[PDB]
Amino acid sequence: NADNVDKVMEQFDYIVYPSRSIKTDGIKAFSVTSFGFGQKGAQAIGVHPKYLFATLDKAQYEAYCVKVQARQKKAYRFFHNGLINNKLFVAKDKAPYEDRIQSKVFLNPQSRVTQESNGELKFPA
């Protein structure tokens, strides 16, 4: 909808306003900026994933990549099941812990959930 960019915007050398999509060799970092009522200005800078991975050893990164691609296969499965059977959203009916355990679970920072015989996740009693 870039009819015709306002002549005012010419003076901003560092900004170029594209009226059509451009496929590039890549983008490294971006800046989103929003402003709000009552002097509410915010800005966030996001940087490309590769740069995080460059912290790791090919050893690590490649171990992770196998994890990811396994997840995607679960995800893929789920998403398709959901579309068909209208279950992309599943309401939980009970917390992970029986009420008996609750206070304890809350208070022990180690307590974690183990997969169960029915594929479900619960805290061990």
Partner 1 sequence: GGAKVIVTTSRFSRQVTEYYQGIYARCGARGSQLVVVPFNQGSKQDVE
Partner 2 sequence: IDALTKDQRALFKQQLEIIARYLKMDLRAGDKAFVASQESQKALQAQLDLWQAEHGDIYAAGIEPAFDPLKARVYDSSWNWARQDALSMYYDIIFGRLRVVDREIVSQCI
Partner 3 sequence: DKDVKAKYEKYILEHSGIRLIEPELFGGYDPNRKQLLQEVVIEQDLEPFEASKEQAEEFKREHGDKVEIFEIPETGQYTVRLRKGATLLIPKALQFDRLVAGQIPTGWDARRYGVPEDIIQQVDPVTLYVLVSVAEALLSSGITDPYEFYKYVHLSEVGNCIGSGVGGTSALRGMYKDRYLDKPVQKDILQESFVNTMAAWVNMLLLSSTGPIKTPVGACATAVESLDVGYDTIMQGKARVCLVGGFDDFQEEGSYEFANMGATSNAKEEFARGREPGEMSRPTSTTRNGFMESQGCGVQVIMTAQLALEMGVPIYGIVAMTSTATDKIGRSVPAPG
* Binding footprint of partner 2 on the chain (CB under 8 A): 3-5, 7, 9-10, 16-20, 22-25
The interface mask with partner 1, positions 13-32, x = CB under 8 A, is ------x-------------
* Shortest CB 7 distance to partner 1, Å: 12
Return the closest-CA partner of residue 30 out of 45, 40, 43.
Answer: 45
Q: Which is nearer to partner 1, 4 or 34 (CB)?
A: 4
Return the closest-CA partner of residue 42 out of 30, 32, 55, 56.
Answer: 32
* Shortest CB 100 distance to partner 3, Å: 13
- Calpha distance 45→28 (Å, rounded): 11
Q: Which does 10 bind (CB under 5 to 8 A by kind): partner 3, partner 2, partner 1, none?
A: partner 2
Q: Which does 67 bind (CB under 5 to 8 A by kind): partner 1, partner 3, partner 2, none?
A: partner 3
- Calpha distance 28→64 (Å, rounded): 22
User: In this structure, what are the phi and psi dihedrals at residue 68, rounded to the nearest 5 degrees?
Assistant: -50, -55
Q: Which does 18 bind (CB under 5 to 8 A by kind): partner 1, partner 2, partner 3, none?
A: partner 2
**Is 35 an interacting residue with respect to partner 3 (CB under 8 A)?**
yes
